[PDB]
């Protein structure tokens, strides 16, 4: 009872949201190099036997709609759920191409009371995004 | 007979709260480069938190920014693993 059951018929979905180009209103830069990440993640999760879905350049409304829709799928035959977010961010926030959305809005769709076919199963969110604007200068070892 | 609605989530953040996260225009982001390398090497052997700890070490030790702007030069990053998991996770 100490390890999650990972021998359901399917490992589960791996949704990759890859935001590279942002509207001028956001004041955000283009994220050169993110397609390398998106391709690397798709291959990595394919080798782990996840059903990978890559989505590119989603608005904040599209992000919320995609996550709502995924949370309404029947995951009963899936062991787990993975979501990877590649975008700009600040603390608690990820950017759609047209502006910010609270990470809690995304993850709430998957709470144990709201996505019953994932209750008891691991829900992994991998977040490549800034969390603010502090720099770590490091210390010599 | 109940579990918490927030249980069984893991948030693998690329950087600590409050910090920038670094991305290389040729190689991809430091965190995702490291995460994919460690999953490729260790997903058939190690538990996920231990894989993520190796990702933390790889990002912290092998990367340092290079910038023509001194303000952004020679900077470092540590990822941040946030686990509300209740069991060990092995991908096999």
């Amino acid at each position: 009872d100490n390890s999650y059951k990972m021998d359901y018929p399917e490992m589960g979905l791996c949704i990759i949201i890859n935001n590279k180009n942002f509207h001028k209103s956001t004041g955000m830069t283009s994220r050169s190099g993110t397609d390398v990440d998106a391709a690397n993640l798709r291959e990595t999760f394919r080798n782990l036997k996840y059903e990978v879905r890559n989505k590119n350049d989603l608005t904040r409304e599209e992000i919320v709609e995609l996550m709502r829709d995924v949370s309404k799928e029947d995951h009963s035959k899936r062991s787990s759920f993975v979501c990877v977010l590649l975008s700009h961010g600040e603390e608690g926030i990820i950017f759609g191409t047209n502006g910010p959305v609270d990470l809690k809005k995304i993850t709430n769709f998957f709470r144990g009371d709201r996505c019953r076919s994932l209750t008891g199963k691991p829900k992994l969110f991998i977040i490549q995004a800034c969390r603010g604007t502090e720099l770590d200068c490091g210390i010599e070892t | 007979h109940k579990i918490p609605v927030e249980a069984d989530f893991l948030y693998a953040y690329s950087t600590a709260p409050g910090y920038y996260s670094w991305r290389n225009s040729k190689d991809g982001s430091w965190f995702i480069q490291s995460l994919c390398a460690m999953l490729k090497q260790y997903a058939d052997k190690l538990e996920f938190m231990h894989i993520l700890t190796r990702v933390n070490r790889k990002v912290a030790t092998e990367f340092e920014s290079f910038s023509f702007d001194a303000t952004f030069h020679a900077k470092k990053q540590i990822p941040c693993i946030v686990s509300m998991l209740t069991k060990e996770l092995y991908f096999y």
Binding site: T29 | Y20, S21, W22, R23, S25
Partner: peptide, 4 residues
């Protein structure tokens, strides 16, 4: 190297 760039920031997000």
């Amino acid at each position: 190297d760039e920031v997000x």
